[PDB]
Write a protein that binds this ligand. Structure first.
Ligand SMILES: N=C(N)N[C@@H]1CCCCNC(=O)[C@H](CCCCN)NC(=O)[C@H](Cc2ccc(O)c(N)c2)NC(=O)Cc2cccc(c2)CNC(=O)CNC1=O
Lengths: 149, 40
C-alpha cells in the first residue's frame, strides 16, 4: 500500500485508476462498485463510499482534503489504459449546480482513466477525474470530484 | 472476477507541462445516482 497512483485492473483490462495516500486507497465508485481489491498478495476492503459523489475508499476513511482554489491552473495526472502516467495542465471551467459551483476539466480520456488524480501546484490531490458530462459536440468535461475527510 | 491494483507512478506536479483544454462554464444537475446532466 505504498503512496502513489495505481491502475485498477480486472482479470487484463484497466477499468480505472486510484490514489494511495495515508494507507487508504481512493477511487471513483463506478470503477469498482465497492468490490474488494487485490494488492500483491493482500486484500483491500471498502471502508466508505457514496454513490451520489461517485467515490469510494478502501482500508480507511477518505483522506484527500485539498480543494481547488477556484482560480489556478491544475494538472490531471492521467493514467490511460495502455499508456504511461502523464501530466496535463489546464484551467478548469465550472459546473454551476443548484448546490454551488464545482471546478471541472475539459479533458477527454478513455473510460479506464476514471479515478486519475487532479493536482494543485503543491502536488496535492484536489479531486479525481471521471464523473462528468458530454457536451453538444460530443466532447467531455469532468467534475473535479473531491470527498470529505 | 479478480480486481487488482498495480502502481503506475508518483503523484507530483510536472513543471513546464503541456497546457490544453478550454474552461467551459456549464449549468448542470446531479441526480441521486451520481449522474451529471446538462440543464438545457
Ligand atoms: N463521451 C466522451 N467523449 N468521453 C468519455 C470519457 C470518460 C472518462 C471517464 N469517465 C467515465 O467513464 C464515466 C463513467 C460513468 C459515471 C456516471 N456517474 N462516464 C461519464 O462520466 C459519462 C457520463 C454521461 C453520459 C452521457 C451524457 O449525456 C452525460 N451528460 C454524461 N459517460 C459517457 O461519456 C458515456 C459515453 C457517451 C457517448 C459516447 C461514449 C461514451 C463513447 N466514448 C467512450 O467509450 C470513451 N469516452 C468516454 O466514455
Amino acid at each position: 500500500t505504498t503512496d502513489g497512483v495505481y491502475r485498477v485492473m480486472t482479470r487484463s483490462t484497466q477499468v480505472g485508476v486510484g490514489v494511495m495516500q495515508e494507507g487508504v486507497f481512493h477511487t471513483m465508485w463506478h470503477v469498482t462498485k465497492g468490490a474488494a481489491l487485490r494488492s500483491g498478495e493482500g486484500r483491500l476492503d471498502p471502508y466508505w463510499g457514496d454513490v451520489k459523489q461517485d467515490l469510494v475508499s478502501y482500508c480507511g476513511p477518505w483522506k484527500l482534503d485539498a480543494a481547488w482554489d477556484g482560480l489556478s491552473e491544475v494538472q490531471l495526472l492521467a493514467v490511460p489504459p495502455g499508456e504511461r502516467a502523464k501530466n496535463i495542465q489546464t484551467l478548469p471551467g465550472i459546473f454551476k449546480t443548484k448546490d454551488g459551483d464545482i471546478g471541472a476539466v475539459a479533458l477527454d480520456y478513455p473510460a479506464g482513466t476514471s479515478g486519475s488524480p487532479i493536482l494543485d501546484k503543491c502536488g496535492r490531490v484536489i479531486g479525481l477525474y471521471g464523473n462528468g458530462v458530454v457536451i453538444k459536440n460530443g466532447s467531455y468535461v469532468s467534475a473535479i470530484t473531491q470527498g470529505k475527510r | 472476477v479478480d480486481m487488482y491494483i498495480e502502481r503506475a507512478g508518483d503523484i507530483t506536479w510536472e513543471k513546464d507541462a503541456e497546457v490544453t483544454g478550454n474552461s467551459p462554464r456549464l449549468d448542470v444537475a446531479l441526480d441521486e445516482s451520481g449522474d451529471f446532466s446538462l440543464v438545457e
